[PDB]
């Protein structure tokens, strides 16, 4: 028994890779040796099961229209991790009213073999899901690049949870750059605006370089950290898995809905 | 009834004809210069009803920017229509048995008590007896309105009566101009023999699209519609 | 007074370049002659000032919270394109109710000078605004790449709007592909997709290649046309505007919600 | 029919060519030079169908941010083709029976009464008859709107006009632009063969299909899609 | 007004101790073998003071799983305790004259009047005059209570009792 690490991959722009970097982070974690499931909290549209090329059976969408539980959901993934599917195109998964999202958070709680590790792929935008995913997660980290629009949007996100949420601690991991001094001054880009406008703590987490070995596992339906663990791509995920493993557990439950606080208040 | 002022309820299927006979009583009684206002409870909302039929006052609830009176007080020195009252939820019941008797209502929103005169003609098609013993029709309120009862029978049980209602339906037709229809001896059994879901509706809806139909001509069994023909 | 064209910029994946198709398309189209207005439907989120580098007094959270009309809110941009803002992180813009959605459809009809092109960039993903949004919209413009996720997401919303509201014609676009043979393979994908399961309309427009030159548009906060006007993406767009220009205008009004049904009704 | 003011109701299955026929009827009709405005209730949300007949002011509720005239206003001088009437909400019902009933109506979130003249033609595909049998449809707008029924017929039941359709068709699509195609026998024969659910829609949605998948060819039995060939 | 079942209007501020001058009415008159039941007004949301003062049959809404019954009938042969009865709305208000002098109620979802023998202790801290004419309060009700008015002073009008 211990409190369980929750991971929310975000950042507001779309097609930023934010899937991609869930995925590979599971499969670097589960390599460290973790037990690390992963949720699809794109609920209206899974991208999970199409990189990875799975094809489950039942999805979240049997949970929520109550046809199964959300153990028998669980499927088998790549290098061990425990991958919770979420509809394609379903009616009832569009849009969720927040006692929806609250009820699947709380569910969550059933789950008790993982070993800390739970990551969490936001949908895009700043929409009432993707706050609601972000707000019950221990560590949020940020995916942006290095363009005007990706900054502008992850910026917004931040002003979003600071102002109407005091949140203040933000992770930021650099994607699609094409040197590490552009993921610096990507970051210190960030940091200016964020200084400028907010009073808020972004940490650096790293760069993941453009890699084409990321767009051939995406046309295999696999991932780059299993099809070709030797790319830079799958390098760096490597060394930001095990600066993420280096991150302190959390030890107090907060006032506001999140994942497992059962484990955050029975083992202090 | 017509020359005693009492509550009346008229029983009948849907579409006999129950406002003509309620406007009949009023203008031949002693209410004929009073007002005759017609209010079908199945039409407003639910949550409604209490403002239409008994009014309310200024800010009584969000929408009430005016101090719109209600329908008993419109009717006072008249006659109320209340039709298919068996919709009418229990607590309006009682409030309506209270108008009855005590000749007393509120307003929504008002503190005071208002005293009207007005004749109550209350139309149903529901069993009211099966209503009472299934705890939905408030038994007392029943015994208060059936002191008169008026039964219209369904046009199925008085076929040999379409003839007359077919004339004076085209009479009418005929005074406002809008033409007219004869048929034949075949039709006219042919309609007999049917069941009228909606019956005098159903006839005068018939009638109006006959017209539309075949204006100025003979109407027998193949020119009428294929529901209403029969061996 | 005509009948004016809405073209409705979508495609459920994120990143596919669905707000640089639109401010490109209506662009090249002003080029053609004719009077454009393009809308920001990412309500929530503003990209289209952002990559046009615009910096809006007023945008359209002033109209929603009741500030301002909606006339005074248009910006002259470039290439005489009138732009509608969209608001950046505005806690009243992130979601808002159908109604909403509804009466700032219906709020456009008080605009009667552009020359029946109205192109509105929606947001990622198949929510609400995005369908609202489109369905309102004579032409529907997917931006589809090739990938097993944008084919997917893209097959998605097709099967939504088909299942759910009735829709069968879409036209089809691809985007940052490496050569025609590609965005040929791509649009058969899709279709043999979309045949397999569904019984709709897919018409191929044509092909965007990938264009460093609009990497470099982005950066410098300009628009590919007008800052790369001889690039390869440049002469692309300019021929899908061509062909854009040639599609049938609308005639009849359609018993749902849509753009200027003033203009639909009175000049029939 | 068409050349009278009577309110229409087109009756048959999904698909079947109803507008066709509404807009036949307007075109006409006495009102030919007046507008044509459709209205679908099955495409517009429970909450939004009396904002879009209606129209509202600058502020009725949490989203009206101008005042815009409704689709009544807009049908002012000509008619207004209500589809798919069947899945209106009951209070909708209640609302239009009362606007054609006192020929005025009033805007969301105002108190001014504002009077039109249309011509009201509705389509259906439910049995409507049965609607009302289990109280989901109200009869009386149900008889207000049948003064003229026109039923139409399944595809599969007039199979012998598939052909001259089909001429029609792809005759329209030489005014719209976009492209042309031609038919074999064996092909015509294989269609005249089908069931046809949807029958019009599905017709044109193939011939639509066909035209953009293979322009300016002609169509064979194996040149068909998918459940269209018949042994 | 100990030796007399009549309907007893306690007035003062929030916080005097009405409560108690309820029970020592109670339990020293003809009902001390009877319920003592107390009713706070404010504390019932307005949209359930109905189904909790009249009671509920099966069915009669939407979560009326049970045909649980009202606070009068519990009170039967005992005492209400109804307190701030100002907040009550004005409908409640003509069914609450009615149970005082026809001595008849009805239950929510129910088609038949129930016959109930209770004392009603009212216990309010507003002026309701005033609200008689701001429109709000019942003056038919008004006079029916105030027959035996019990007015507890404020502990800052009474500063010499602080000690005992
Ligand atoms: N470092 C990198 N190098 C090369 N391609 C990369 C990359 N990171 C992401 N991509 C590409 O980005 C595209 C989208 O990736 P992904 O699906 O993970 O993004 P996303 O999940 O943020 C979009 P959405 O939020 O809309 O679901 C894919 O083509 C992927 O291969
Ligand atoms: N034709 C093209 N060639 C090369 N890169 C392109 C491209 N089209 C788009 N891109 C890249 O994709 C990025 C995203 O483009 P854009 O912001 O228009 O996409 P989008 O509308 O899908 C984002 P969202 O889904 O969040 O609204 C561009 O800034 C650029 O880096
Ligand atoms: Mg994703
Ligand atoms: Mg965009």
């Known amino acids: ?268 | 009834v017509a020359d005693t002022d009492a509550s009346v309820l008229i029983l009948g299927e849907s579409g006999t004809g129950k406002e003509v006979v309620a406007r009949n009583l009023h203008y031949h009684s002693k209410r004929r210069e009073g007002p005759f206002v017609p209010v079908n409870c199945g039409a407003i909302p639910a949550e409604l009803l209490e403002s239409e039929l008994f009014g309310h006052e200024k800010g009584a609830f969000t929408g009430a920017i005016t101090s719109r009176a209600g329908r008993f007080e419109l009717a006072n020195g008249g006659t109320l229509f209340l039709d298919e009252i068996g919709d009418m939820p229990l607590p309006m019941q009682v409030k309506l048995l209270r108008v009855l008797q005590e000749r007393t209502f509120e307003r929504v929103g008002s503190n005071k008590t208002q005293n009207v005169d007005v004749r109550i003609i209350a139309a149903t098609h529901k069993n009211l007896e099966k209503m009472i013993e299934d705890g939905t029709f408030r038994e007392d309120l029943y015994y208060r309105l059936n002191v008169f009862p008026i039964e219209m029978a369904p046009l199925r049980e008085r076929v040999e009566d379409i003839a007359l209602l077919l004339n004076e339906l085209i009479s009418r037709m005929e005074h406002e101009k809008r033409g007219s229809i004869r048929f034949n001896s075949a039709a006219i059994m042919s309609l007999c023999r049917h069941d009228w879901p909606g019956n005098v509706r159903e006839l005068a809806n018939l009638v109006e699209r006959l017209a539309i139909m075949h204006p100025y001509g003979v109407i027998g069994v193949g020119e009428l519609p294929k529901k209403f023909r029969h061996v």
Chains 1, 3 share one sequence.
């Not at chain 1, 930001?240 to 959390?250: E, G, N």
């Open chain 1, 1 to 268: 028994m211990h409190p369980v690490q929750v991971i929310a991959v975000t950042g507001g722009k779309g097609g930023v890779g934010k899937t991609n970097v869930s995925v590979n982070l599971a499969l670097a974690l589960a390599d460290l040796g973790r037990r690390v499931m992963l949720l699809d909290a794109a609920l209206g549209l899974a991208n999970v099961d199409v990189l990875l090329g799975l094809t489950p059976k039942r999805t979240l969408a049997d949970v929520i229209e109550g046809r199964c539980e959300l153990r028998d959901v669980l499927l088998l993934g790549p290098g061990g991790v425990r991958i919770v599917p979420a509809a394609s195109g379903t009616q009832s998964m569009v849009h969720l009213s927040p006692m929806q999202h609250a009820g699947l958070i709380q569910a969550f709680s059933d789950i008790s073999d993982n070993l800390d590790v739970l990551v969490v792929d936001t949908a895009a935008g700043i929409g009432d899901s993707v706050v609601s995913f972000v707000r019950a997660a221990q560590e949020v980290l940020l995916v942006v690049c290095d363009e005007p629009t990706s900054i502008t949007d992850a910026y917004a996100l931040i002003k979003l949870l600071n102002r109407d949420h005091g949140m203040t601690r933000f992770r930021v991991l650099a994607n699609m750059a094409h040197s590490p001094q552009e993921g610096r001054n990507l970051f210190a880009k960030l940091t200016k605006v964020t200084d400028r406008f907010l009073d808020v703590a972004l940490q650096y987490v790293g760069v993941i370089p453009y890699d084409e070995s990321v767009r051939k596992a995406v046309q295999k339906q696999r991932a780059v950290y299993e099809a070709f663990p030797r790319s830079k791509a799958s390098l760096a995920f490597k060394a930001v898995a095990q600066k993420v493993d280096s991150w302190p557990l959390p030890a107090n439950p907060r006032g506001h809905l999140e994942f497992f606080v059962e484990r955050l208040v029975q083992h202090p």
